[PDB]
Structures are given as structure tokens and as C-alpha cells.
Amino acid sequence: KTRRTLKGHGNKVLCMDWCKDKRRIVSSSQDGKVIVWDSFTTNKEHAVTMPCTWVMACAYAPSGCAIACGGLDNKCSVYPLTFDKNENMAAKKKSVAMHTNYLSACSFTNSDMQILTASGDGTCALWDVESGQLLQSFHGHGADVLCLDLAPSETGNTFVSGGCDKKAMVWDMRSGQCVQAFETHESDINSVRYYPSGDAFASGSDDATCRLYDLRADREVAIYSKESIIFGASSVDFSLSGRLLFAGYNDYTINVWDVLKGSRVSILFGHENRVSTLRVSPDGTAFCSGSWDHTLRVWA
């Protein structure tokens, strides 16, 4: 149920992120234009232009005082969001990541001192925001790493990452090891998202299958697939109550699932091109998802 549209991007929308105040939606696009428009009135609060193009990594700090972005530039930078109205946002750039391959995705921690970068070099890296130096690397996937999601509720000092390595692996910053590994998707891994409880996580793959893994059993729980859907999902998310499995697909539409049942509860569409991102608002009342159709419409 689309309620508003956001036409502020010159090229296709690649990724976006929410805020704890539900009014600071940030995003990245193919051109390199990042806008932090308000969620309700659809007005650009403030915007910045990335010097490079093809940026699909963008995260929003839980406190709201900074944003991170990056793309095919092998770079991840932090843009502080201090008020400082009489300033150009390009001056406060903070280069952080020293990557040898394009940055697939970056995210903050609950504390705004660490960022985790998933890149095509096959390694996930942890960077200290303040000091700017590398904390520790995560050797692992023998191929590109695409998705990266932090656990909620203390994070367990753990995060999951997946890519074209055909598997999703859970790490642990306290020891830097792949504590758990799941290899059951028969296709490329695109997106991953923890369950609200934190002990489970779903993952979308190019085989148009959504799979739910329970960490308390180390086995897949529920298969989410239909013969009608043949285009792989690009994004996936959970409802606030944990009963719905909002997932973005390349079939120009959005498929809605039930966590308990998965009996095709509903479906929605509207986008004219591939859906690239799909995030649920923190309040849980509504949600949003961008697409390659140059628009980032919002559903309520």
C-alpha cells in the first residue's frame, strides 16, 4: 500500500537505511547522490554528492550524528551529521576503509565507534570509527561477499555475511572466527537479516528462495518459494512483531511471507525496475523499499 514517493535521485536507487527518529531516511544511488530526506513530508533535509559513482553501501548511525557510504571506489567514508549549517558536507569527509575491491555493504554497530565493511575481496573488515584504523579482518568466503547484517540485542558481538560463496557464515569479533556456517541456498546470496529475537535470520538468494535459519539448531527452518516467482530476491526483512517476512524481488514486485506459515499472505508491486533495497521502519507501523526505477516509494 504505497502512500508516498521520493523522486530525488538521478539514477537507480541501490540501498537505503532508516533512523531511530523515523525522520532521517538516507540512501545511496548509482550516480553517487546521497540524500537524507525526511520520511513523512518527502523533503530533502540535506544531501551530499559522492565523488565516485556506483555506491550501494549506506548505513545510518543509531544516534543519528553520522552516516557511512561507499561503492566501487574501494572506499568507505563517514559523514558526520553535526548541525553546522554553514558548512559543505564534503569537507567533513572521513576516509576509513582501505579495500582492494568494491564495497558491497557497510553498517554501524549499536555504538558509533565501529563499522563493518563487506567487499568483493572476500573478507569482511572491522574499522574503528574514531581512530580510523583497522580493528580486525575476517578471512572466510572464497569469493565475493555481498550482504552483511549485525545482530540485535548486544549483537552477541556477532554478525553474518554472505555472497557468491554459496554460504552464509556467522562471525564473532571477540575471537574473529566463523562460529557458524550455513550452506543450503543453491544460488548467489544477495541479502540477509536477523530475526527480531536475534537467534534466527533469513536470507534471500538468486534462486528466488527465502530461507530461515535457526542458530539454536544449526539447520534451515522454513522454505519460502513459489513456482510463480522465478527471479531471485534481492532484499529481505522481518516485521517488528516477527510474524511477516517482507522480501524484495527482482520481478518488479514485493512478496510478503508469513514467518510461522509462509502461505502467501499478500503481495504488492508498483516499481518499474528491479528492487534493490527493502528495510522496515523501526517503529514497525510502516516500511519502505527502493528500486532501480529511480524511485524509493514508501508503503504504509
Binding site: 543519528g64 550524528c65 548541525f83 554553514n86
Partner: protein, 536 residues
Amino acid sequence: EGPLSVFGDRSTGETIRSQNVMAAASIANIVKSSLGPVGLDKMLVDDIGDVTITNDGATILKLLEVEHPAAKVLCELADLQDKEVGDGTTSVVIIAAELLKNADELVKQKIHPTSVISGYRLACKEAVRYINENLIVNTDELGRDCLINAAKTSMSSKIIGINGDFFANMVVDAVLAIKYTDIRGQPRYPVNSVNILKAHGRSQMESMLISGYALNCVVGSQGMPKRIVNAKIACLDFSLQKTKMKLGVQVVITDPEKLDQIRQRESDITKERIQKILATGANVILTTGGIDDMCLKYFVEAGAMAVRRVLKRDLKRIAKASGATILSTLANLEGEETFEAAMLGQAEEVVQERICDDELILIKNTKARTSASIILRGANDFMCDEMERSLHDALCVVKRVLESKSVVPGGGAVEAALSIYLENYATSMGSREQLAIAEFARSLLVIPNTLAVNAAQDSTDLVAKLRAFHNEAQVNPERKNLKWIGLDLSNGKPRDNKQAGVFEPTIVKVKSLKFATEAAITILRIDDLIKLHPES
């Protein structure tokens, strides 16, 4: 493609040397037609119909799209000359290109580039020494008229050249007005403190030199008075809006009765601040931040002038001129929130003047410091922009003449004298550096030649006469007064330029020579080019 195995092109030796010389010659030839009083302006259509009419070499080279690296070297050379001197931007490019051309001509005769570079360095050093020793005039002897003549000479070839009798007076008055002294007694003239406002309309003769400061701003509300007889200017670096709690502060209401009081305080804070600022006695309030409606209403009821979104540099200049103090917060060392009368600037008048359907603020006769501003009137926007560029060049020239009290004769006199002296001097330095210094001297003659050519006159005859005059001056001890003989482009005959009042700052010639020599050496240092193919 050969055994080198590099993904790109490669030019070596004479091919790349000729390419670099050709690129430098192209850059020189673009601006060669805009040198001297008989030079002409240029249009620069900006691919979307934007028109720029200019004679300034730095502007022409900055606006152009340049791809060859040596052509770039010349373009940034012009930009550096403009930044560090402000005049001679065309001359330095022309001289550098001619130096490079003659150096390459020498190199093609199997003269090693190192010898040419050594000769060029020796020639530049000796030229600077000769200029400083024999071709300078102390401006203290000529008085103020020297400044007027220097400004008029600088404004020739510009759109304000014919009006020099008036524009030179205006420039000199402004520069003398913005003069201030620092420790150790050094008098420095901070140009760029002369705000220049462009507004089409009346003729050039109707341009005004403000005895104060001019703001490109208006009053925030129509209800305020638009003139103050005795201004008490207060400068603020903060906005006057409804105060809101910062990011680390939240308002949580459990007893609903407190909401009204909180909402009242939310604007009463700003009201109290404005009340303090008005109670100190202020009449005009200038701020770099915004002002919303209720604060404007307070200023309206107080019978004061309030201006918002004032530029930071403009605010700094106004504060320096009027003696005001910039305030970012109303906080003292006692932890309280007070505004004092000791930090109020004063001026004799503040007027909402109207200039060609648009209005602006005039702050006239600021006390405790003298300030100047110029409002230029022209036929249209392009002509006003060209007037501004010419005016800036004149201001820079006057500043150079005042800071360094030495001037040199213009109209190619220095170039001809240097050519003769260096040609004579080359005979006693080495064997191939002889040729290098001779070519340096010959290359220095490109300036009078271009001047004569631009006037559609016999360049060869005029330059020969100038060289004969300067040779006689250097040979005969009693004819040393012929050093000032330059070129009279109006009549196409040699003329004593010192008597004619054609002067340039010595720094212009010295810096142009040094920069041209360095650029020529840098370009001549290349004998091989590798251009890797782009990976896009």
C-alpha cells in the same frame, strides 16, 4: 607493438619536443591578440550560451578547455602570475612560450638541453639584477602622480581604458582609504577589502566610490526604517530564531501543566536576548544567520534596522571599519548573558539606497577606521564583469606600487634594454650558454613586437629603432636617459615612456621573468612522453 609492452602511446625526442613547443605556441597565440592598449577583448561562449567578455589572460586561460600537459603548464603559469602579482598575465605566457620556442630551436641544432637551461638561468638572474640596478624609478620622487600614472597604464587595454583619468583617481583613493599599519611600522594595503558591487544602468562615469562600506543586502522586514542618522552597529555571528533544545536534550512531559510554560520559554529566550541587544542602545543589527518573523517584529517596534544572512567576510570588514566586535554568543566570563555598549560599532549613516530597480545597504563614514567600496555601473552584466576584472587588476597594481616603491618604464622599454644588455653580456659566458643567453635576449623582444603588431604598424622598424636607442644608451655614458624610451602605440613611434607616465611595478617584470624561465625549463626538461590508455 614492439618489445616495450606498455598499454599506451609513446613519443620520443624531436617529436615530443615539437609537440610541446606547438602546444605552448597555441596557448600563446590564443591570448597574443589582447596585449597592450591596442589589444581587443574576446567572447567566450560557454556551451550553454553564457557569454564572458574579457581581456584578462588568466580568465581566458582558466575558462578554456585545455588537454595537452604543456598547455596546462602555461595555463597554471598564468593563474599563478595572476594570484601572486595580478598583472602581466598575458605577458608571462607570451614570454614563456617564446622562450620555449627559441630553446627548442637551439636544441634541434644538437645543443644539449642542459646547456640551454643553464644559459636561461644565468640570463634570468642577470636580467633581474640589471632591472633592479639600472631600470627602476623611485616612486617617492614622483609623488602621488606616479600612482595615477601606474593605474592608468594598468587600465589601458581594458574596457575602462579611455576613462582612466577618472578610474585611476577612484582606484588610488580607495587603496589609500583601505590602508592600515601593523607592528614594526610596515604599511600594508589589504586589497579585497574594497567590496566591488556591479549593477547595470547609468554610464561608467556615474560609478560611485563609497566613503564607507556597501552591502549587497536589504532590511529583513518592510516595517523597519530604511535610514539611521547615527548608526550604532551591532554585529552578531548567530541566528535570531526560536531556540530549540540541542540533540542531547529531550522534553518529556508527565504533568501536562508544564507544556505551556516550556513553549513560552522556547521564544522568550530569544526575546530576552533581543531585548538586551536593543537596550544597550543599538540601532543597526547585522547577523550572518537567519532572523524569523517575531525577532523582525521586535526590531520593527524598536525602530531599528535588522539585516540577515550577511556574508561572513562582509561582516568582518564592517566590524573592522566601524569598530564593532563580532559576537557568536552572548556569554561573558561571569557565566551570565549580557551585551555591553563597549562592543558597538558606529557610523555616520546607514541607508537603504536604490540602484537600478534593486536596493542595497550603504554604511557611510564608519568611525575608528576608513573603508572604501566601489559600485560599478555599465550597460549590461558582461560589461560590468569586465569592469570588475579591470578594476581588480588596477587595485593590485596600485597595491604593488605602494608596497614596493620601485617602478619600471612600460611599453617594451625594459624588454629592449634587457635584450641589448643580455646580447652584449652573453659574449663573456661559456661557449654554448652564449647561444642560450643570446636566445633569451632575442625571446625577450616578443613583447614590443606583439605590441606593434596589435596596432597594425611596422613591428620590425619600431623594434629596430627601440634597439638602436637602447644600444646608444648603453654604449654612450651621457645618453643614459634613453633607457626610458619605449613605444607610443597611438602614433607608432618611439617615445620617452617615463615622461609619458607609462609605468609598471618592478615586481611584475621580475616575477614574470622568473616564472617564465621556470616554466620554460620545466617544459624543456621533457624528451619523452608515455600516454597510458584510459581504463574506462
